[PDB]
Amino acid sequence: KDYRKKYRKYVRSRFQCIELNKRYTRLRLIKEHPIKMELLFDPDEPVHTVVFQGAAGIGKTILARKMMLDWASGTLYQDRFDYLFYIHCREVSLVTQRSLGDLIMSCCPDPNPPIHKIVRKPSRILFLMDGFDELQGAFDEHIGPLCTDWQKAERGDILLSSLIRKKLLPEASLLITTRPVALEKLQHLLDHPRHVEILGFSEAKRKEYFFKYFSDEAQARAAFSLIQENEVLFTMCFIPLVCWIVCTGLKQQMESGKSLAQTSKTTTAVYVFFLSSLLCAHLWGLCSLAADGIWNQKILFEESDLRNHGLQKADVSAFLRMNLFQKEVKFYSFIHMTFQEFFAAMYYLLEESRDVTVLLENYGKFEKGYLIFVVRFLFGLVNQERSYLEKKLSCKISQQIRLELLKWIEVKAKAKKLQIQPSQLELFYCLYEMQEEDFVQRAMDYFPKIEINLSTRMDHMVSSFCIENCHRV
């Protein structure tokens, strides 16, 4: 345990704040579809593979980092593990060749760590695979041949396919967080996995977060009230990212005299609500970036990367960094993947914006990025009656794109469901964004018979909005 102490200290160092350790709200977990974190690995004969289905922005990354902090502070798995390695998939190549040791040695504080004494005992090692989806580039069952040597340098996709199929440190423990969609690629790999669902806050712990954001007990009460009276923002705030998006927007209108109000009905109109809360001159550049980034599988941007797309004289430094960027290690990423997809979407709808027919030929593909929010938003945006920023929008070029989205929904509504995505519900979400009734009802035609997969009460809404638009008398 000479080095174990040094390693644990380093882990407390990196994982002590989300991006201190204070505003964390207990997210809801459900096994076999309420599990204590410690009890996860315990047998039903022990477990070597856990997977957290997590919706984007539900705090899967935070919940991970917390497990790291708690263990790194002796709170949980003191007895079960000697080492927890946090792998941020976002960062790791899938083409680069590397060894399990090379990948491991990066997790460590010092430069030449005792790697051979770490692997000594793998039954005491847990890898935290954070955002299996955030992996950039293709991934397919086809990949081979599978590796069996930790010291051997395969290219990332092989190496991980080998680690996940438990061929590399078989009796390692492994905890993968992932988006629901990316479960299709990953389901086959898993060695007898234990599935867990991150659900986000409850109604209670929805309250809890507001009074953890709002320093003043009154400013907190007045700004949770909005969200009971509003229906969308209540349903919509079981999700933590929204909660933040919402309360960072209730805080400069907490600055101004504007008696608090957000009458937002759609996800797009909440992003755009918050997007405006932080307000132009370099607007074109951001959207330029995100849409090369999504297309070219880059979630992390270097300074150099930035100077090309725009900010030729220190725009990012002041204008954007405040709330729309995060700096990692010298490299920069958007405060969330979604906001990237947004500007990537929003990039196709502006004053002189590329070809849209391209995007749709490959919707729901892993390697080009799922493009869930790429699509989903630019229905809620292209919407004619849906602002101020509405200006930067090209009024004329909008119903260029609006007229093909309907061609593509039509295709997808009544096929043999060749592709998995879009599952009907996603099209409903596309449709609840594109709030224009006439467009919705017309699309509703194309569905012969509908099919519901309702988990949460947000699902219930988006669905039950579209249902009545269906009727053809």
Ligand X SMILES: Nc1ncnc2c1ncn2[C@@H]1O[C@H](COP(=O)(O)OP(=O)(O)O)[C@@H](O)[C@H]1O
Binding residues for ATP: 25, 54-62, 336
Residue 328 and residue 125: Cα distance in Å, rounded?
25
Per-residue tokens: 226: 């909005």
Contact, 153 vs 314, CB < 8 A? no
Kindly identify the residues of this chain, within the stretch 420-449, that bind ligand A1D79 according to CB under 6 A: 423, 425-426, 429
- Would you call 254 helix, strand, or coil by DSSP? coil
Residue 108 and residue 128: Cα distance in Å, rounded?
14
CB of 80 to ligand X, least distance (A): 23
Q: Which of 25, 48, 52, 57 is the binder for ligand A1D79 (CB under 6 A)?
A: 57
210 vs 379, beta carbon nearer ligand X: 210
By a kind-dependent CB cut-off of 5 to 8 A, residue 285 interacts, out of ligand A1D79, ligand X, none, with none
By a kind-dependent CB cut-off of 5 to 8 A, residue 267 interacts, out of ligand X, ligand A1D79, none, with ligand A1D79
Kindly identify the residues of this chain, within the stretch 380-439, that bind ligand X according to CB under 6 A: none
Collect contacts of 273-279 with beta carbons under 8 A, ≥24 apart: 273/249, 274/245, 274/246, 274/248, 274/249, 275/342, 275/389, 276/387, 276/388, 276/389, 277/248, 277/249, 277/252, 277/253, 278/252, 278/322, 278/323, 278/324, 279/388, 279/389
Contact, 242 vs 58, CB < 8 A? no
Contact, 164 vs 118, CB < 8 A? no
Stretch that binds ligand A1D79, among 90-98, 117-125, 345-353, 451-459 (CB under 6 A): 451-459
CA angle 24, 25, 28 (to 5 degrees): 135
Give the rounded distance of the alpha carbon of 174 from its chain centre.
Answer: 20
Binding mask 196-215 for ligand X (x = CB under 6 A): -------------x------
Residue 56 interacting with ligand A1D79 (CB under 6 A): yes
- Would you call 195 helix, strand, or coil by DSSP? strand
Residue 63 interacting with ligand A1D79 (CB under 6 A): no
Q: Which of 99, 230, 267, 340 is the binder for ligand A1D79 (CB under 6 A)?
A: 267
Residue 239 interacting with ligand A1D79 (CB under 6 A): yes
Per-residue tokens: 47: 């477990």
Residue 465 interacting with ligand A1D79 (CB under 6 A): no
Question: What one-character DSSP code corresponds to residue 281?
Answer: T
91 vs 133, beta carbon nearer ligand A1D79: 133
By a kind-dependent CB cut-off of 5 to 8 A, residue 23 interacts, out of ligand X, ligand A1D79, none, with ligand X
Residue 220 interacting with ligand X (CB under 6 A): no
164 vs 243, beta carbon nearer ligand A1D79: 243
CB of 345 to ligand A1D79, least distance (A): 13
* Binding site members: 25, 54-62, 336
Residue 281 and residue 195: Cα distance in Å, rounded?
46
Q: Which of 168, 172, 181, 196 is the binder for ligand A1D79 (CB under 6 A)?
A: 181
Q: Which of 136, 338, 435, 463 is the binder for ligand A1D79 (CB under 6 A)?
A: 338
Element housing 380 (H / E): helix 372-382
Per-residue tokens: 17: 């704040």
Binding mask 247-286 for ligand X (x = CB under 6 A): ----------------------------------------
Find the distance separating the first CA and the last CA of the chain, reported in whole Å.
74
Residue 183 interacting with ligand X (CB under 6 A): no
CA angle 148, 152, 153 (to 5 degrees): 120
Element housing 3 (H / E): helix 2-14
Residue 238 and residue 164: Cα distance in Å, rounded?
31
- Would you call 431 helix, strand, or coil by DSSP? helix
390 vs 459, beta carbon nearer ligand A1D79: 459
Question: What one-character DSSP code corresponds to residue 423?
Answer: P
By a kind-dependent CB cut-off of 5 to 8 A, residue 456 interacts, out of ligand X, ligand A1D79, none, with ligand A1D79
By a kind-dependent CB cut-off of 5 to 8 A, residue 59 interacts, out of ligand X, ligand A1D79, none, with ligand X
Residue 240 interacting with ligand X (CB under 6 A): yes
Residue 458 interacting with ligand A1D79 (CB under 6 A): yes
Measured from the Cβ of residue 229, the count of other Cβ atoms closer than 10 Å reads: 10
Kindly identify the residues of this chain, within the stretch 14-73, that bind ligand X according to CB under 6 A: 18, 23-25, 27, 54, 56-62
Residues that bind ligand A1D79 (CB under 6 A): 55-57, 179-181, 239, 241-242, 267, 338, 372, 423, 425-426, 429, 455-456, 458-459
Q: Which residues bind ligand X (CB under 6 A)?
A: 18, 23-25, 27, 54, 56-62, 131, 209, 240-241, 244, 336-337
